[PDB]
Amino acid sequence: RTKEEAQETRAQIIEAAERAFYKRGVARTTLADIAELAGVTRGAIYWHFNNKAELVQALLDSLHETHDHLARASESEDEVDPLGCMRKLLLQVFNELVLDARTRRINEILHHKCEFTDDMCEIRQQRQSAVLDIHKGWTLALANAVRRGQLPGELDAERAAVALYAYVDGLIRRWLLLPDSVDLLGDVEKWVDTGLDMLRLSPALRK
Amino acid sequence: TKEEAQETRAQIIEAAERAFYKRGVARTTLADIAELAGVTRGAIYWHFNNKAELVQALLDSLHETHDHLARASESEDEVDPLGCMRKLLLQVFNELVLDARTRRINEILHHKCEFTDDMCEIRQQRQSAVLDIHKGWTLALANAVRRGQLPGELDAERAAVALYAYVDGLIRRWLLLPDSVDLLGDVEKWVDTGLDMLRLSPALRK
Ligand SMILES: [Mg+2]
Ligand SMILES: [Mg+2]
């Protein structure tokens, strides 16, 4: 069928884009390069994607799927243990980064093999949107945890969400750069609780 | 003469910041930078063997302003090593927000510089630079432990990693979304939030 064959083609393109961007970077890779790696025609790849920026976004967008269940739970005001949902969420983020070759490779592309240039302004714009989306969700989950007595009552939820994101994002990039400097999988619980401890203990994050 | 060459080097590095910031590192060549700087007859290749050496020069330049406080925090004779670390981090954030050159170089290194194994040196040099920072921060935190400023059972190495993750992440976050985080007005609070992680989290203790 048309759709089944089209989904298969799009999937081949995306897998080849991961391979191309990881080895040679986003800047110098072309859609024609990716089509040759995927074994599809140039008419096919350009039918699925208009430019490289759309292929980068497809990889970026693919990262949230695994975590959607725990994210929504943490953000629900009816959830009785919102902080516990955040802890399970962060454990899953790190566990997937270490174990999944795809998650690791996409993260490496976004962090270390993809430049922000006004020649391709959409890459930076869409990164801004993704990070703001995460911020909005984490601010809600932290406020819920405050409401349930799991975090300090005077916590600045917004600054707390920024502090947590900084730590998590910085540890991901540090592990990608020096994977042997950090036993992210074996000590994963310790790395998660270090971040949460910052939020629930530091008086600098309170109003 | 000696000053002619030191001037020419500075002209090149300043043009490299302009070229890398506009077009990124991957697609910028030493030839492009030379024309942008206006230095002729192959002079740029006298100063830099390749583009990765130029990139390292930009990164190396970030350590200069903080060297006094970094060396102090690491000295065994320093009686206030954690206070040195606080002053170090305050200055890092103050310079990042206030200094156009520091901000632009950080944006280049964080957001406009690909690691490609055709240019394997860029990644390798970044690894060595972050390992150097980690060695120094581990020593400064160990000094703070010795001086009773941090918990005796602190895992100095993991604490240095945790602090770096936070600082590095906060810099990148501010570069991406500067209007979200008043890094300058609230600088003391952003610093103390990270230091509080080390002072208070039982998860960083051995
Ligand atoms: Mg996933
Ligand atoms: Mg400086």
Side-chain angles (χ1 to χ4, degrees), chain B residues 61-62 64-66 95 99 102:
Chain B
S61 75
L62 293 179
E64 289 171 18
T65 305
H66 320 303
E95 186 188 35
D99 180 21
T102 295

Coordinates of all heavy atoms in Angstrom, one line a residue, chain B residues 61-62 64-66 95 99 102, ligand 2:
Chain B
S61 N 41.9 31.0 25.2 CA 41.7 32.4 25.6 C 40.7 32.6 26.7 O 40.7 33.6 27.5 CB 41.4 33.3 24.5 OG 40.0 33.1 24.1
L62 N 39.8 31.6 26.9 CA 38.8 31.8 27.9 C 39.3 31.6 29.4 O 38.8 32.2 30.3 CB 37.6 30.8 27.7 CG 36.8 31.0 26.5 CD1 35.7 29.9 26.4 CD2 36.1 32.3 26.4
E64 N 42.1 32.7 30.5 CA 43.1 33.8 31.0 C 42.6 34.6 32.1 O 43.3 34.8 33.1 CB 43.5 34.6 29.8 CG 44.3 33.9 28.7 CD 44.5 34.7 27.5 OE1 44.3 36.0 27.5 OE2 44.9 34.1 26.4
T65 N 41.3 35.1 32.0 CA 40.8 36.0 33.0 C 40.7 35.3 34.4 O 40.9 36.0 35.4 CB 39.5 36.6 32.6 OG1 39.6 37.2 31.3 CG2 39.0 37.6 33.6
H66 N 40.4 34.1 34.4 CA 40.1 33.4 35.7 C 41.3 32.6 36.2 O 41.2 32.0 37.3 CB 39.0 32.3 35.4 CG 37.9 32.8 34.5 ND1 37.2 33.9 34.8 CD2 37.4 32.3 33.4 CE1 36.3 34.1 33.8 NE2 36.4 33.1 33.0
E95 N 31.5 37.7 33.4 CA 32.2 37.9 32.1 C 31.3 37.5 31.0 O 31.2 38.1 29.9 CB 33.5 37.2 32.1 CG 34.4 37.5 30.9 CD 35.6 36.6 30.8 OE1 35.5 35.4 31.2 OE2 36.6 37.1 30.3
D99 N 30.8 40.5 28.7 CA 31.9 40.6 27.7 C 31.4 40.1 26.4 O 31.1 38.9 26.2 CB 33.1 39.9 28.1 CG 34.2 40.0 27.1 OD1 34.2 40.9 26.3 OD2 35.2 39.1 27.2
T102 N 33.8 37.1 25.2 CA 33.6 35.8 25.9 C 32.2 35.2 25.5 O 32.2 34.0 25.3 CB 33.6 36.1 27.4 OG1 34.9 36.5 27.8 CG2 33.2 34.8 28.1
Ligands
MG2 MG 38.6 36.4 29.6

